[PDB]
Amino acid sequence: TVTEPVGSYARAERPQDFEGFVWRLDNDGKEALPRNFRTSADALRAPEKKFHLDAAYVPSREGMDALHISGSSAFTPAQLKNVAAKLREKTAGPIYDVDLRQESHGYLDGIPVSWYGERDWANLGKSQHEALADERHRLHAALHKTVYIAPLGKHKLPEGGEVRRVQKVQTEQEVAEAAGMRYFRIAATDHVWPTPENIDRFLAFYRTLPQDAWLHFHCEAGVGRTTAFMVMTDMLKNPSVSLKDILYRQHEIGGFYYGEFPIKTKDKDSWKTKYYREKIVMIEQFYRYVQENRADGYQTPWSVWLKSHPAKA
Amino acid sequence: TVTEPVGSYARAERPQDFEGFVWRLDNDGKEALPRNFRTSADALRAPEKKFHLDAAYVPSREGMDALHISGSSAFTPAQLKNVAAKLREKTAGPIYDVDLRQESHGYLDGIPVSWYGERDWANLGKSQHEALADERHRLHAALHKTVYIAPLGKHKLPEGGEVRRVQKVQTEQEVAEAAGMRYFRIAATDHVWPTPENIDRFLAFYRTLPQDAWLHFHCEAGVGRTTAFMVMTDMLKNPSVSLKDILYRQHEIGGFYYGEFPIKTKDKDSWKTKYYREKIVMIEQFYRYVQENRADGYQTPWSVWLKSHPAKA
């Protein structure tokens, strides 16, 4: 009798210990595009040293040209318009802004902000419905009120920033639609493997997509959650490609490396260690799911399959 | 007809532009006593060069022995106890904690904090009734809630600090009583000359004090507001002492110098200039009030006298 199965470790954490306390600045808006911007059409670059990978290995690019996905960090409204314009040059299909952020976020006077709590876990434990309700309520409450917006600096605490009286409030959905993109929200908790609910919702969405749909995934930094869903998409759409190639190529186009590697964090970040290990095992488990259920058209969803085929540490 | 008379310049500022946005740390509690602690029993020291005074001048100390007043910056509960113990060695009369802070402040888990707005004007324009209501509501709303407490750094904006879930909330009144001091609040706005309302309340308070009462004044830093009331008390209790002596000696025991001096401010602090000039003028006007109204025992209140005898720029 296990309390939390692998893939659900974050459920053991106490939400009350990571409550939001400040409007974090999501992007300073100085660059034309969000950070870590990349597409499946991009050329593969040398792997990052920290993953101790084979720099000589050349992964197959089979299916990358038809993949039609991209990823990035959070963005200002102008930056998102730039992304959309760039993605429109690559396709005539619907372009989706796939928001993977569980944390409450939006735009105050056009400034991309998020309600930040320790570890960015201000909405930990909330259902997607409660997180989005908190988001709507917090954004609305900011209108015509004085707010402190700051970037995090030394030790993930506010540093400098600015104070203003908000005259306009927008949700990311509004910002996406103003950029001509369709919007899809998946409330994934920062730093950890996406929940079975997060993944079931994604696979359900994925099967409704027209052939030429282009998915632009993003989280806060554009690394952890963004690459997890990019990899999942790659595996679903190109089930013939080996796990190694999927992981290598999503990393080499600019994303995270979701395969095994020597995990090393700063003392102050030791809490991330088991979550990285968990991600590695779940990635392999998701690959198994795709391989075992593609043939029948996914009659059984990921959550159900995972419960009868639990992952092991 | 004049919109704002001299002594009421701050009434021209818009309170909506300085609303509170963070719980400022009023004292890190590392020292045994609050900053700028001083008593009227202290020896006089050399003046500060910035005031360009006569270091050779020997101010009269007539009445200082019996003046019985002290001043300091804000403090932690432990620091206030230390102040009270110190003062109790000088008197057998009641010891008053004279809180001159208009800004909402209190103690979260024993930590001295204040709801800080730009220029520390989060309660600008509020009656004392409204200011105290804001304070009570905010303090109480913090209980069992997550808060961000931080000291101000570069450009008067949060820098570092800590996040915590508050388990205890106290007003300065409770902290004062626990330290064996009586409490008297005067909601004076930071950086400016106390209002006719502030001074009227102070004078009425002063009139019914026991002969052996000891007044410990304080504000946030313990300089501007603290010295203003210490000076007023000195003039009230020792009317035969010259203005020059009062100003010099209140300055030489560790307070601000309230006489004419070469005002010099940084560009980002150029807004303080006229408030410093206003204070200089109002100090002279108050002294005049004391000299012309003492004979009949101050039958006419400061506010009323000031209206029929407006100060001049």
XYZ file of C-alpha atoms in Angstrom:
626
model
C 0.000 0.000 0.000
C 1.762 3.102 -1.339
C 0.582 6.623 -0.431
C 1.757 8.269 -3.651
C 2.760 6.323 -6.731
C 5.715 7.367 -8.852
C 4.660 10.250 -11.120
C 2.624 11.733 -8.283
C 5.335 12.658 -5.776
C 4.304 16.322 -5.682
C 0.969 15.316 -4.118
C 2.938 14.727 -0.894
C 3.922 18.410 -0.622
C 1.825 20.813 1.492
C 0.227 23.570 -0.626
C -0.137 25.834 2.427
C 3.651 26.048 2.600
C 4.036 27.629 -0.865
C 1.293 30.313 -1.012
C 1.647 33.199 -3.472
C 3.071 36.434 -2.075
C 4.075 38.625 -5.003
C 3.323 39.468 -8.620
C 6.381 38.133 -10.387
C 7.600 39.797 -13.591
C 7.336 37.010 -16.237
C 9.356 38.765 -18.994
C 11.001 42.204 -19.137
C 9.916 42.550 -22.764
C 13.309 43.809 -23.942
C 13.808 41.105 -26.600
C 11.669 40.689 -29.716
C 10.884 37.089 -28.807
C 10.361 35.095 -25.634
C 13.333 33.133 -24.274
C 14.229 29.589 -25.352
C 12.195 30.006 -28.518
C 12.512 26.964 -30.861
C 10.630 24.953 -33.452
C 10.736 21.380 -34.694
C 12.089 22.771 -37.961
C 15.266 24.024 -36.280
C 18.714 22.537 -36.870
C 20.134 20.350 -34.057
C 22.887 21.910 -31.964
C 25.563 20.440 -29.705
C 24.136 18.942 -26.484
C 24.547 20.764 -23.133
C 27.503 19.415 -21.122
C 25.498 18.985 -17.937
C 23.631 16.048 -19.508
C 26.857 14.142 -20.332
C 25.498 13.033 -23.698
C 27.215 11.781 -26.852
C 28.082 14.906 -28.886
C 28.949 12.613 -31.777
C 25.485 11.002 -31.837
C 23.218 12.197 -34.633
C 19.532 11.548 -33.902
C 17.084 10.782 -36.696
C 15.031 13.764 -37.850
C 12.300 11.537 -39.235
C 8.968 13.326 -38.925
C 10.438 16.598 -37.609
C 9.421 18.601 -40.690
C 5.801 17.550 -40.237
C 5.888 17.766 -36.421
C 4.766 21.421 -36.332
C 5.506 22.360 -32.756
C 7.512 25.029 -31.008
C 8.243 26.071 -27.449
C 9.276 29.091 -25.385
C 9.186 30.920 -22.073
C 6.512 33.402 -20.997
C 6.127 36.531 -23.120
C 4.800 40.050 -23.381
C 1.822 40.657 -25.698
C 4.120 42.115 -28.356
C 6.486 39.159 -28.089
C 3.593 36.731 -28.597
C 2.503 38.636 -31.713
C 6.016 38.234 -33.036
C 5.875 34.477 -32.398
C 2.519 34.109 -34.107
C 3.712 36.024 -37.151
C 6.767 33.765 -37.285
C 4.703 30.592 -36.935
C 2.187 31.801 -39.555
C 5.020 31.736 -42.122
C 5.321 28.043 -41.458
C 1.736 26.920 -41.727
C -1.767 27.631 -42.921
C -3.356 25.716 -40.083
C -4.590 26.879 -36.698
C -1.791 28.047 -34.363
C -2.362 27.228 -30.725
C -0.897 28.911 -27.725
C -0.660 25.945 -25.377
C -0.380 27.451 -21.904
C 1.046 24.823 -19.526
C 1.101 27.039 -16.428
C -0.766 26.028 -13.289
C 0.368 29.213 -11.547
C -2.073 32.115 -11.821
C -0.840 34.545 -14.464
C -1.929 37.239 -16.875
C -1.171 40.800 -17.862
C -1.294 44.005 -15.875
C -1.101 47.053 -18.170
C 0.345 44.697 -20.814
C 2.973 43.478 -18.358
C 3.175 39.635 -18.117
C 2.946 38.728 -14.415
C 2.312 35.626 -12.287
C 1.207 35.155 -8.673
C 4.385 33.690 -7.298
C 4.755 31.518 -4.243
C 7.829 29.560 -3.109
C 8.972 27.127 -5.854
C 6.293 28.773 -7.982
C 3.798 26.475 -6.256
C 1.103 29.089 -5.425
C -1.612 26.875 -6.994
C -0.249 23.499 -5.855
C -3.006 21.020 -5.051
C -5.764 23.022 -6.761
C -7.843 21.431 -9.491
C -7.519 23.093 -12.877
C -10.906 24.690 -12.147
C -9.846 26.180 -8.796
C -6.531 27.437 -10.232
C -8.233 29.206 -13.123
C -10.856 30.624 -10.735
C -8.096 31.976 -8.470
C -6.461 33.452 -11.571
C -9.579 35.227 -12.797
C -10.336 36.515 -9.305
C -6.774 37.771 -8.640
C -6.464 39.471 -12.025
C -9.768 41.219 -11.688
C -8.971 42.360 -8.161
C -5.859 44.102 -9.489
C -7.767 46.490 -11.794
C -7.503 50.113 -10.537
C -5.387 48.958 -7.622
C -1.766 49.535 -6.729
C 0.466 46.559 -7.355
C 4.083 45.673 -6.839
C 5.636 43.847 -9.794
C 9.116 42.526 -9.408
C 11.578 40.166 -10.935
C 13.096 37.570 -8.639
C 16.727 37.888 -7.869
C 18.854 36.800 -5.014
C 17.432 33.542 -3.666
C 14.131 33.687 -5.540
C 12.997 36.770 -3.634
C 11.771 40.107 -5.095
C 14.509 42.458 -6.244
C 13.723 46.027 -7.294
C 10.790 46.061 -9.691
C 8.060 48.672 -9.896
C 4.835 49.892 -8.381
C 1.838 51.002 -10.403
C -1.881 51.483 -10.411
C -3.361 49.046 -12.933
C -5.609 50.437 -15.646
C -5.960 47.234 -17.684
C -6.181 43.528 -16.920
C -6.056 40.663 -19.396
C -5.913 36.917 -19.296
C -3.452 35.096 -21.490
C -6.391 33.775 -23.497
C -7.283 37.310 -24.523
C -3.658 38.026 -25.344
C -3.399 34.850 -27.450
C -6.579 35.604 -29.387
C -5.318 39.180 -29.995
C -2.219 37.578 -31.540
C -4.425 35.404 -33.762
C -3.748 32.181 -31.891
C -6.155 29.622 -30.525
C -5.757 29.026 -26.782
C -5.487 25.839 -24.731
C -4.791 25.716 -21.032
C -3.140 22.883 -19.149
C -2.596 23.623 -15.457
C 0.747 21.898 -14.873
C 2.675 22.457 -11.685
C 6.097 23.993 -12.202
C 9.232 21.792 -11.767
C 7.448 18.428 -11.598
C 6.195 15.717 -13.928
C 2.691 16.595 -15.322
C -0.186 14.789 -13.491
C -2.289 12.027 -15.081
C -5.094 14.589 -15.313
C -2.787 17.046 -17.130
C -1.780 14.346 -19.624
C -5.294 12.911 -20.158
C -6.487 16.415 -20.943
C -3.596 16.892 -23.422
C -4.134 13.596 -25.255
C -7.864 14.324 -25.488
C -7.055 17.739 -26.995
C -4.429 16.228 -29.248
C -6.872 13.861 -30.948
C -9.231 16.735 -31.823
C -6.523 18.641 -33.714
C -6.745 19.114 -37.453
C -3.791 17.716 -39.421
C -2.159 21.084 -40.026
C -2.466 22.271 -36.415
C 0.680 23.910 -35.040
C 1.294 23.763 -31.303
C 3.295 26.444 -29.528
C 3.927 25.223 -25.976
C 5.187 27.413 -23.203
C 5.586 27.604 -19.479
C 7.371 30.206 -17.347
C 11.007 29.537 -18.292
C 10.242 27.429 -21.375
C 12.348 24.471 -20.212
C 10.752 21.794 -17.931
C 7.017 21.641 -18.710
C 7.397 22.954 -22.281
C 9.856 20.190 -23.233
C 7.803 17.484 -21.477
C 4.794 18.199 -23.722
C 6.953 18.742 -26.773
C 8.428 15.256 -26.213
C 4.966 13.741 -25.646
C 3.763 15.298 -28.881
C 6.846 14.021 -30.714
C 6.254 10.492 -29.389
C 2.566 10.523 -30.274
C 3.043 11.843 -33.764
C 6.268 9.972 -34.617
C 5.863 6.619 -32.765
C 8.480 4.988 -35.062
C 11.315 7.142 -33.765
C 13.384 5.639 -30.953
C 13.102 7.042 -27.453
C 16.776 8.056 -27.640
C 16.264 10.054 -30.801
C 13.147 11.781 -29.465
C 14.943 12.816 -26.265
C 18.150 13.857 -28.062
C 16.440 15.865 -30.783
C 14.076 17.736 -28.464
C 17.064 18.648 -26.373
C 19.298 19.613 -29.308
C 16.690 21.966 -30.781
C 16.894 23.871 -27.499
C 14.770 21.999 -24.951
C 15.474 19.993 -21.794
C 17.095 16.542 -22.009
C 14.516 14.099 -20.604
C 16.759 11.023 -20.550
C 19.014 9.593 -17.847
C 21.909 11.830 -16.753
C 24.006 12.646 -13.655
C 21.690 14.979 -11.729
C 23.550 17.735 -9.852
C 21.809 20.619 -8.140
C 22.965 23.409 -5.910
C 22.607 22.648 -2.187
C 19.754 25.145 -1.996
C 18.056 23.281 -4.874
C 18.410 19.711 -3.511
C 14.625 19.421 -3.301
C 14.549 19.245 -7.134
C 16.623 16.037 -7.278
C 13.864 13.474 -6.728
C 11.609 15.395 -9.100
C 14.188 15.145 -11.900
C 14.618 11.438 -11.272
C 10.851 11.053 -11.317
C 10.635 12.875 -14.656
C 13.144 10.447 -16.188
C 11.157 7.366 -15.184
C 7.813 8.870 -16.206
C 9.143 9.865 -19.635
C 10.009 6.217 -20.272
C 6.645 5.161 -18.928
C 4.832 7.569 -21.280
C 6.825 6.131 -24.178
C 5.651 2.644 -23.144
C 2.063 3.888 -23.058
C 2.282 5.209 -26.606
C 3.905 2.063 -27.902
C 1.380 -0.227 -26.203
C -1.811 1.754 -27.028
C -1.266 3.384 -30.420
C -2.393 0.320 -32.383
C -5.942 0.364 -31.018
C -6.332 4.126 -31.183
C -5.874 4.766 -27.479
C -9.094 3.074 -26.313
C -7.761 3.440 -22.764
C -6.351 6.805 -21.485
C -2.994 7.378 -19.848
C -4.316 7.749 -16.253
C -6.038 4.346 -16.382
C -3.158 2.575 -18.088
C -0.648 4.094 -15.647
C -2.609 2.854 -12.647
C -2.520 -0.732 -13.910
C 1.131 -0.284 -15.052
C 2.676 1.849 -12.299
C 6.156 3.207 -12.828
C 8.953 2.191 -10.489
C 11.770 4.222 -8.978
C -7.810 82.878 -1.343
C -5.126 80.216 -0.827
C -5.766 76.538 -1.460
C -3.184 75.140 1.010
C -1.627 77.280 3.728
C 1.994 76.988 4.810
C 2.206 73.960 7.092
C -0.302 72.030 5.008
C 1.621 71.551 1.745
C 1.213 67.768 1.887
C -2.564 68.208 1.535
C -1.870 69.045 -2.151
C -0.392 65.587 -2.871
C -2.716 62.829 -4.185
C -3.008 59.888 -1.766
C -4.016 57.484 -4.559
C -0.500 57.789 -5.984
C 1.234 56.508 -2.832
C -0.816 53.453 -1.809
C 0.814 50.689 0.238
C 2.220 47.674 -1.574
C 4.496 45.750 0.815
C 5.104 44.907 4.458
C 8.303 46.775 5.166
C 10.696 45.456 7.840
C 10.878 48.329 10.386
C 13.878 46.850 12.289
C 16.023 43.728 11.848
C 16.197 43.401 15.645
C 19.960 42.735 15.590
C 20.826 45.487 18.101
C 19.715 45.684 21.748
C 18.107 49.101 21.280
C 16.355 50.895 18.442
C 18.397 53.331 16.320
C 18.909 56.990 17.278
C 17.987 56.292 20.892
C 18.498 59.438 22.966
C 17.227 61.119 26.124
C 17.051 64.684 27.407
C 19.485 63.590 30.139
C 22.194 62.942 27.555
C 25.320 65.009 27.109
C 25.463 67.261 24.087
C 27.669 66.221 21.202
C 29.230 68.057 18.236
C 26.700 69.161 15.630
C 26.562 67.391 12.278
C 28.591 69.194 9.606
C 25.672 69.158 7.126
C 23.853 71.645 9.351
C 26.727 74.174 9.235
C 26.303 75.186 12.884
C 28.632 76.744 15.428
C 30.451 73.812 17.035
C 31.900 76.284 19.543
C 28.441 77.258 20.776
C 27.413 75.939 24.183
C 23.598 75.602 24.283
C 21.908 76.244 27.573
C 20.745 73.076 29.345
C 18.186 74.892 31.481
C 15.231 72.552 32.050
C 16.732 69.495 30.378
C 17.134 67.655 33.693
C 13.408 67.840 34.304
C 12.335 67.642 30.626
C 11.993 63.815 30.765
C 11.767 62.877 27.092
C 13.466 60.466 24.737
C 13.396 59.448 21.105
C 14.234 56.548 18.821
C 13.514 54.696 15.626
C 10.969 51.868 15.371
C 11.735 48.700 17.309
C 11.149 45.023 17.897
C 9.293 43.966 21.037
C 12.553 42.947 22.729
C 14.091 46.320 21.908
C 11.119 48.221 23.378
C 11.468 46.268 26.638
C 15.106 47.305 26.756
C 14.166 50.936 26.238
C 11.553 50.789 28.967
C 14.035 49.253 31.413
C 16.552 51.930 30.571
C 14.046 54.743 31.047
C 12.657 53.258 34.271
C 16.096 53.878 35.733
C 15.505 57.586 35.226
C 12.006 58.023 36.607
C 9.285 56.679 38.849
C 6.531 58.239 36.788
C 4.492 56.733 33.962
C 6.509 55.996 30.802
C 4.705 56.664 27.509
C 5.358 55.148 24.180
C 4.409 58.058 21.899
C 3.817 56.463 18.490
C 3.965 59.215 15.853
C 3.502 56.942 12.829
C 0.557 57.616 10.526
C 1.509 54.617 8.419
C -0.124 51.307 9.339
C 2.290 49.223 11.371
C 2.418 46.342 13.808
C 4.036 43.036 14.617
C 3.786 39.823 12.671
C 5.285 36.913 14.642
C 6.977 39.591 16.757
C 8.492 41.230 13.689
C 7.971 45.047 13.435
C 6.424 45.788 10.053
C 4.611 48.564 8.257
C 2.419 48.742 5.154
C 4.730 50.773 2.948
C 3.680 52.958 0.064
C 5.966 55.272 -1.936
C 7.473 57.952 0.342
C 5.915 55.944 3.192
C 2.623 57.713 2.419
C 0.236 54.727 2.350
C -2.154 56.565 4.754
C -1.676 60.079 3.436
C -4.817 62.159 3.749
C -6.623 59.742 6.076
C -8.079 61.000 9.353
C -6.505 59.337 12.375
C -9.769 57.303 12.664
C -9.419 55.965 9.117
C -5.664 55.358 9.426
C -6.142 53.273 12.611
C -8.963 51.326 10.958
C -6.736 50.496 7.964
C -4.038 49.294 10.387
C -6.388 47.111 12.457
C -7.933 45.516 9.364
C -4.610 44.802 7.670
C -3.000 43.425 10.785
C -5.908 41.145 11.453
C -6.082 40.044 7.800
C -2.465 38.828 7.995
C -3.176 36.229 10.677
C -2.813 32.660 9.390
C -1.925 34.113 5.996
C 1.251 34.089 3.943
C 3.095 37.412 3.879
C 6.230 38.868 2.313
C 8.318 41.035 4.658
C 11.281 42.894 3.298
C 13.634 45.742 3.965
C 13.936 48.503 1.394
C 17.071 48.709 -0.616
C 18.033 50.447 -3.770
C 15.510 53.128 -4.721
C 13.183 52.383 -1.790
C 12.021 49.066 -3.270
C 11.892 45.606 -1.632
C 15.157 43.724 -1.607
C 15.407 40.195 -0.287
C 13.496 39.600 2.926
C 11.460 36.561 3.920
C 8.135 34.840 3.376
C 6.102 33.418 6.217
C 2.740 32.212 7.361
C 1.782 34.444 10.295
C 0.789 32.733 13.531
C 0.654 35.878 15.723
C -0.508 39.441 15.188
C -0.004 42.381 17.605
C -0.498 46.156 17.580
C 2.166 48.478 18.936
C -0.265 49.244 21.754
C -0.126 45.636 22.895
C 3.635 45.582 22.512
C 3.878 48.832 24.488
C 1.654 47.590 27.323
C 3.619 44.328 27.492
C 6.707 46.459 27.965
C 5.169 48.394 30.851
C 4.600 51.599 28.878
C 1.469 53.593 28.329
C 0.589 54.176 24.707
C -0.381 57.282 22.847
C -0.770 57.450 19.113
C -0.383 60.454 16.874
C -0.892 59.620 13.206
C 1.767 61.942 11.668
C 2.725 61.605 8.003
C 6.350 60.637 7.326
C 8.725 63.398 6.003
C 6.409 66.388 6.612
C 5.442 68.916 9.274
C 2.802 67.450 11.647
C -0.725 68.657 10.806
C -2.771 71.065 12.893
C -4.827 68.010 13.856
C -1.740 66.086 14.990
C -0.448 68.965 17.064
C -3.895 69.769 18.565
C -4.176 66.156 19.761
C -0.649 66.270 21.118
C -1.226 69.485 23.048
C -4.442 68.192 24.641
C -2.543 65.028 25.619
C 0.321 67.067 27.040
C -1.992 69.227 29.189
C -3.259 66.309 31.298
C 0.032 64.488 31.815
C 1.280 63.838 35.347
C 4.182 66.067 36.347
C 6.556 63.074 36.335
C 5.431 61.600 33.015
C 8.239 60.482 30.706
C 7.596 60.657 26.958
C 9.387 58.329 24.601
C 8.727 59.530 21.067
C 9.370 57.528 17.924
C 8.633 57.254 14.266
C 10.133 54.907 11.661
C 13.754 56.202 11.495
C 13.504 58.294 14.660
C 14.682 61.565 13.062
C 12.123 63.889 11.413
C 8.860 63.312 13.265
C 10.529 62.254 16.506
C 12.613 65.425 16.789
C 9.700 67.695 15.799
C 7.636 66.565 18.834
C 10.669 66.440 21.086
C 11.337 70.069 20.116
C 7.710 71.037 20.659
C 7.748 69.419 24.078
C 10.980 71.192 24.963
C 9.517 74.597 23.952
C 6.301 73.904 25.838
C 7.966 72.802 29.044
C 10.825 75.356 28.910
C 9.346 78.541 27.281
C 12.100 80.717 28.779
C 14.713 78.912 26.689
C 15.700 80.567 23.422
C 14.746 79.040 20.087
C 18.420 78.671 19.247
C 19.099 76.735 22.423
C 16.152 74.386 21.934
C 17.091 73.639 18.303
C 20.786 73.195 18.987
C 20.370 70.975 22.052
C 17.655 68.735 20.551
C 20.032 68.282 17.650
C 23.131 67.736 19.795
C 21.584 64.943 21.830
C 21.129 63.038 18.579
C 18.145 64.527 16.801
C 17.565 66.505 13.661
C 18.441 70.185 13.485
C 15.222 72.134 12.915
C 16.766 75.526 12.248
C 17.854 77.128 8.975
C 20.565 75.236 7.108
C 21.875 74.639 3.555
C 19.301 72.155 2.300
C 20.927 69.660 -0.065
C 19.096 66.720 -1.594
C 19.793 64.128 -4.259
C 17.964 64.528 -7.587
C 15.603 61.656 -6.812
C 14.911 63.273 -3.424
C 14.394 66.832 -4.714
C 10.741 66.437 -3.685
C 11.762 66.707 -0.005
C 13.261 70.197 -0.401
C 10.083 72.228 0.107
C 9.002 69.992 2.986
C 12.277 70.788 4.761
C 11.756 74.506 4.143
C 8.163 74.269 5.376
C 9.287 72.494 8.576
C 11.858 75.232 9.307
C 9.163 77.878 9.037
C 6.592 75.934 11.037
C 9.100 75.341 13.874
C 9.415 79.106 14.228
C 5.639 79.504 14.103
C 5.105 76.925 16.808
C 7.672 78.639 19.027
C 5.749 81.859 18.475
C 2.557 80.038 19.436
C 4.124 78.859 22.666
C 5.425 82.326 23.513
C 2.142 84.126 22.803
C -0.300 81.615 24.329
C 1.388 80.413 27.473
C 0.289 83.392 29.615
C -3.388 82.399 29.498
C -2.666 78.691 29.661
C -3.179 77.907 25.950
C -6.895 78.684 25.841
C -6.848 78.840 22.057
C -5.768 75.633 20.256
C -2.878 75.525 17.829
C -5.121 74.914 14.787
C -7.272 77.913 15.581
C -4.370 80.194 16.402
C -2.560 79.082 13.191
C -5.534 80.018 11.010
C -5.621 83.568 12.421
C -1.771 83.717 12.351
C -0.694 81.918 9.113
C 2.967 81.113 8.675
C 4.880 82.735 5.811
C 7.085 81.002 3.264
